[PDB]
């Protein structure tokens, strides 16, 4: 179909043409190797015992080294072109995916995105390359073989290529005849098989009533029936091979009959004949290879259409351009009803949550639905389905997206530390902005210096995966250091599970207290200490804040907070 | 492979020998077909003679008729041998399967039982036949071709065939080297792809921070890897290809060098070298095929061992020599504990149920746990796990199985009607015992003659599957007719469906009352009318005989019968 990746491969058209010429020369070497038979057959043997036959080994070994060099060069160059186009496709796909919304990553198919970016892309490249090399090198081979046949024997090729379609239509009609006979009788085969099945399904009924002698006689008759049907199957299927071989040898016999001396043929054959036949029994292979070229090309184009469908999806909407340097103004959720995309049930109904500036507000809901959703809603990682999230006098939609990202920071047990040095991870995308001294001080006041000093290289050790592979609490402290260096006016604190890690829960809690001394703290902690520390506490059963107030006030108004507090202890 | 099984195939040895000689002749056909080449080439065209060329087409086409006839005869005769082996194997398998215990019919795999009857029985014969044709035909071709090489060239054959394994080991070591390189490279590729996967899964945390170029740049570096590493996939593999070709052509050079460099060889004429090379390339195939003979043989022998194990498995136990003409005595359980084989939970604990002679007992239970298994137990489908069943003062295990099975008769909504005529189905395995007049008398007394009266051919119509396809209520009517003709002293009724068919339920109930007017009859049933009509009513919830007494008494004492009276309405 329509491919618009040609501008991608246009800069590398030179390498592609070099690969094509290499494949042309490869096919030329192969067909010249085939044509090498005739001088060998005539002069090498018939004329003399020794003469041409000494030159020919050198000629064929030379042709083979030429063929190998051409094949290797073509493979290397087409690999270069494929690698470059797949390089461009991969980086374009990832660049789009950077700004592309969370919706595809919202469990649409996360594991298959890896396939899309690597396996399907290289499948597109390999399919296109395979189609190109196949069509060019097999067209070259076909042209070379045809010119060989016409040059060596002008009159033999026309009769033989006239005969070949006749044999083709004969083979097709015979195969169709025997295939439909086969399936037509296989219907009866299935009938008898079902008869035997129903016969044996009455095992209890046979056992209870009478004996098996009548049953054995019935199975004997049915067995004889399927045995004769199997006779018919094997006979009908086996007679195909004699018939097809007979047709092929009839074609050969007619060819030889034409080769019988008249005035047309045999004037110039000598040992030519085998060469012609050799070429034909070679020529049958590329044409078959040429049959699948279109199918392979269509498969590659379908994969490329999938990739283009991924690419053409709209990026994250960022129409709002209002900028905000510091977000000291409070956050205000006002009757904000959110629905998860792909989820029929409303994830979050209208909620009037207030988050005053420089205060601790704690989400204490235990239902597990909507608790982490608000952390995404405050950050425009999902669209605002309904209601207004007004921060510092303006709604989140109006604000520049990148602004809202840098203003807010979130720290959780789950944190994807990037494959880099710890110092670079501490200031992601801000290493130019933040000095190494600032990074060290941030790690110090986050109480993570023990973990950095533990590793040999320290501030430059590769903390990412396939590197240090540090423990989860250490990842949390790295994240707290990231937020602390950023000094985000708005902090989100998930704390999914409160683990009293030895020698580390005290340090991480101290770091949490250090970070949340100032700035708003939207905390989803299951730890009772943070809940008590919260200036306000909210419990939401996915619809609305059932209870609002202090933890003691929420204890006074039991509702659902009482049993929740029982699980807290 | 300790298959043995030869007594089965011994009487059909003559067909096997005829197939073998025909197949050897078929291989000799190919040998002589290639032998025709040297007269066709050396003395056909290079020679000025004409008639020798006209000789070839007729002889090759007649050779092809010989090949086709030999192939057809071989296929037909080995089909005969295979069909007879399958005949005896299927017969001896099905006889044992009917003799196999009901515990073998454990619902383990009902369709694979047919597969053993159909798929595995044909697999053993097909595999044995394939191994036979492969070894005989391909070995005949191999030995004939070697005789060819030694006949046409006493010298070139030995050098070519001693050089061939050298080329084989060279190909093996080179291919193994490249495969090892590629294989250990695959692990590096797998490791590299994990970096891209990690960066992709980290989108959730890329977006909150600045991300952007520091992501893409990093990805770009990783993007280069599967290009460069990707080149190592295609580069090395590519340079694997011509090298294995090159050395092969080097061998093709060497023999050709040996064609001329000696002053001794000097005896190839023109076509004999072509005959030798053609015979080599035509020999490569049968050597490959002959390598797979052991695999086919062992696979077929494994399927044969499955069938042999099924045949050798112990039948239903028949260690009872006590014979009863008519079971006029009472049937009674004494603390009979039963467990389904393959089930850990005791299906039925100890039960001491007594059934007086003549009187009717009903079993009631919604879930059916424990209720249904008893009706099978009295027929010795599943042997007792513990306890004893006293029939006429002796144990059922003591009684002869075939003798007992005639005493009790089963009636249910689901009855496997055999594909014979209605008259046979009424007197299955008893058509000689009872007269046709008795059969129609039983049909009339069953009060279901009408459905058979309106039937086209009357009592002689094929009634089972691939026939009239009778209705399930009418199947139950046929069963009540079966019992009427048998006049079994013991009756078990299932009555699971409890279907109130219009005008057929009434006749069914009338027939049930007619049959159970006399003789012992226990009835599982959800019908309140039948439960009331029962002389005794029993409720079993898989644990114990919960309630014993009349239905009014079982209503007076709540227990569980009241809950049954709820949905009996």
UniProtKB/Swiss-Prot annotation, chains A, B:
**What keywords were assigned to this record?**
ATP-binding, Cell inner membrane, Cell membrane, Lipid transport, Membrane, Nucleotide-binding, Translocase, Transmembrane, Transmembrane helix, Transport
Q: Where is the ABC transporter domain?
A: 331-567
What does the annotation give as the result of altering residue 77 to S?
Does not affect ATPase activity
Cite the effect that the entry attributes to residue 500 to P. Loss of ATPase activity; ATP is still bound
Q: What is its EC number?
A: 7.5.2.6
One GO CC annotation: membrane
What follows loss of this gene? Absence of MsbA alone causes accumulation of hexa-acylated lipid A species and glycerophospholipids in the inner membrane.
Q: Which residues form the ABC transmembrane type-1 domain?
A: 16-299
Q: What does this protein do?
A: Involved in lipopolysaccharide (LPS) biosynthesis. Translocates lipid A-core from the inner to the outer leaflet of the inner membrane. Transmembrane domains (TMD) form a pore in the inner membrane and the ATP-binding domain (NBD) is responsible for energy generation. Shows ATPase activity. May transport glycerophospholipids. In proteoliposomes, mediates the ATP-dependent flipping of a variety of phospholipid and glycolipid derivatives. May also function as a multidrug transporter.
UniProt comment concerning the protein's domains? In MsbA the ATP-binding domain (NBD) and the transmembrane domain (TMD) are fused.
Query: What name does the UniProt record give this protein?
Result: ATP-dependent lipid A-core flippase
Q: Which organism is it from?
A: Escherichia coli (strain K12)
UniProt lineage: Bacteria, Pseudomonadati, Pseudomonadota, Gammaproteobacteria, Enterobacterales
């Amino acid at each position: 179909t329509f491919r618009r990746l040609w501008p991608t491969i246009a800069p590398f058209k030179a390498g592609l043409i070099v690969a094509g010429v290499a494949l042309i020369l490869n096919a030329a070497s192969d067909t010249f190797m085939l044509s090498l038979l005739k001088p060998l057959l005539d002069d090498g043997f018939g004329k003399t015992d020794r003469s041409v036959l000494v030159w020919m080994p050198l000629v064929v070994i030379g042709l083979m080294i030429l063929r190998g060099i051409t094949s290797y060069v073509s493979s290397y160059c087409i690999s270069w072109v494929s690698g470059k186009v797949v390089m461009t496709m991969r980086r374009r796909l990832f660049g789009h995916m950077m700004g592309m919304p969370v919706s595809f990553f919202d469990k649409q198919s996360t594991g298959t995105l890896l396939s899309r970016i690597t396996y399907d892309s290289e499948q597109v490249a390999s399919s296109s390359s395979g189609a190109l090399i196949t069509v060019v090198r097999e067209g070259a081979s076909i042209i070379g073989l045809f010119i060989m046949m016409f040059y060596y024997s002008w009159q033999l090729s026309i009769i033989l290529i006239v005969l070949a379609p006749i044999v083709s239509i004969a083979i097709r009609v015979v195969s169709k005849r025997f295939r439909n006979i086969s399936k037509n009788m296989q219907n009866t085969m299935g009938q008898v098989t079902t008869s035997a099945e129903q016969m044996l399904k009455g095992h209890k009924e046979v056992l209870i009533f009478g004996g098996q002698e009548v049953e054995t006689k019935r199975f004997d008759k049915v067995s004889n029936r399927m045995r004769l049907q199997g006779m018919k199957m094997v006979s009908a299927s086996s007679i195909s091979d004699p018939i097809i071989q007979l047709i092929a040898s009839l074609a050969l016999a007619f060819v030889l009959y034409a080769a019988s001396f008249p005035s047309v043929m045999d004037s110039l054959t000598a040992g030519t004949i085998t060469v012609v036949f050799s070429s034909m029994i070679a020529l049958m292979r590329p044409l078959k290879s040429l049959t699948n070229v279109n199918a392979q090309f269509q498969r590659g184009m379908a994969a490329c259409q999938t990739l283009f469908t991924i690419l053409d999806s709209e990026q994250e909407k960022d129409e709002g351009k209002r900028v905000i340097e510091r977000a000291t103004g409070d956050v205000e959720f006002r009757n904000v009803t959110f629905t998860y995309p792909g989820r029929d049930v409303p994830a979050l109904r209208n909620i009037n949550l207030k988050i005053p500036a420089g205060k601790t507000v704690a989400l204490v809901g235990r239902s597990g639905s909507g608790k982490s959703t608000i952390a995404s809603l405050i950050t425009r990682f999902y669209d605002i389905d309904e209601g207004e999230i007004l921060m510092d006098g303006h709604d989140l939609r109006e604000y520049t997206l990148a602004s809202l990202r840098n203003q807010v920071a979130l720290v959780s047990q789950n944190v994807h530390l990037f494959n880099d040095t710890v110092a670079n991870n501490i200031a992601y995308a801000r290493t130019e902005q933040y000095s190494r001294e600032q990074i060290e001080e941030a790690a110090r006041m986050a109480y993570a210096m023990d973990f950095i000093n533990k590793m040999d290289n320290g501030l430059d050790t590769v903390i990412g995966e396939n590197g240090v592979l540090l423990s989860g609490g250490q990842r949390q402290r790295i994240a707290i250091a990231r937020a602390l260096l950023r000094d985000s006016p708005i902090l989100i604190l998930d704390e999914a599970t409160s683990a009293l890690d030895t020698e580390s829960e005290r340090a991480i809690q101290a770091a949490l207290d250090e970070l949340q001394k100032n700035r708003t703290s939207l905390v989803i902690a299951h730890r009772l200490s943070t809940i008590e520390k919260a200036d306000e506490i909210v419990v939401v059963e996915d619809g609305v804040i059932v209870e609002r107030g202090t933890h003691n006030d929420l204890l006074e108004h039991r509702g659902v907070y009482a049993q929740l507090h029982k699980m807290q202890f």
